[PDB]
Design a protein around this ligand. Structure first.
Ligand SMILES: CC(C)N1CCN(C(=O)c2cccs2)CC1
Length: 185
């Protein structure tokens, strides 16, 4: 892929974070805390899952960013509508406003409904995410494997501004404490 030149600087929006997340001073890293992080509740926060949005909103053009997932057992990454549901239980699907992939129990899957098995030969340590708003495309790239394609959502119906989307996952096992990190340009 030759998408690197649409690189955008993403930062995390603290106000949207689940109340157990810890976001670094530079707003470029997030991890699961071992308790409530002593913040007030608000209508933006994801209540049920360890999710957070990027601050940036995109309604046109081409955008690219990279995320470090080193040594995590579980995570979701992609984009979502600015208007997605924050409270209660929901599935990651395009019908609900999400264009995502994930790692869960040693399998990588795309968030179609129902979900799609991904065929990854080299477990990724960094993921590239490309959005073409006008074309209706979200693509995922394996930066560890020379940028190989992971998955393309095409014919996307965004139906609103898009935000970068992250889920650090639960840490029931004690093996998933590591952060998601936004990688330097
Ligand atoms: C890895 C983990 C943090 N993900 C939580 C959110 N998630 C879903 O909502 C779905 C699962 C099956 C259909 S949708 C995908 C898995």
């Amino acid at each position: 892929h030759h998408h690197h030149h649409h690189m955008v600087h993403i930062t995390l929006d603290r106000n949207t974070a689940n109340s157990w997340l810890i976001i670094s001073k530079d707003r470029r890293q997030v991890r699961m805390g071992d308790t409530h992080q002593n913040v007030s509740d608000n209508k933006e926060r994801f209540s049920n899952y360890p999710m957070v949005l990027g601050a940036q909103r995109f309604s046109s053009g081409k955008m690219y960013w990279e995320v470090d997932v080193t040594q995590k057992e579980a995570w979701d990454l992609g984009v979502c509508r600015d208007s997605v549901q924050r409270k209660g239980q929901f599935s990651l699907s395009p019908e609900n406003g999400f264009w995502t992939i994930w790692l869960w129990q040693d399998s990588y899957e795309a968030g179609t409904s129902p979900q799609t098995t991904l065929h990854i030969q080299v477990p990724p340590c960094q993921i590239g995410i490309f959005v073409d708003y006008e074309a209706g495309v979200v693509s995922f790239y394996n930066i560890t494997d020379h940028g190989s394609l992971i998955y393309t959502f095409s014919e996307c119906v965004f139906a609103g501004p898009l935000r970068p989307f992250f889920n650090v996952g639960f840490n029931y096992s004690g093996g998933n404490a590591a952060p998601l990190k936004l990688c330097p340009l």
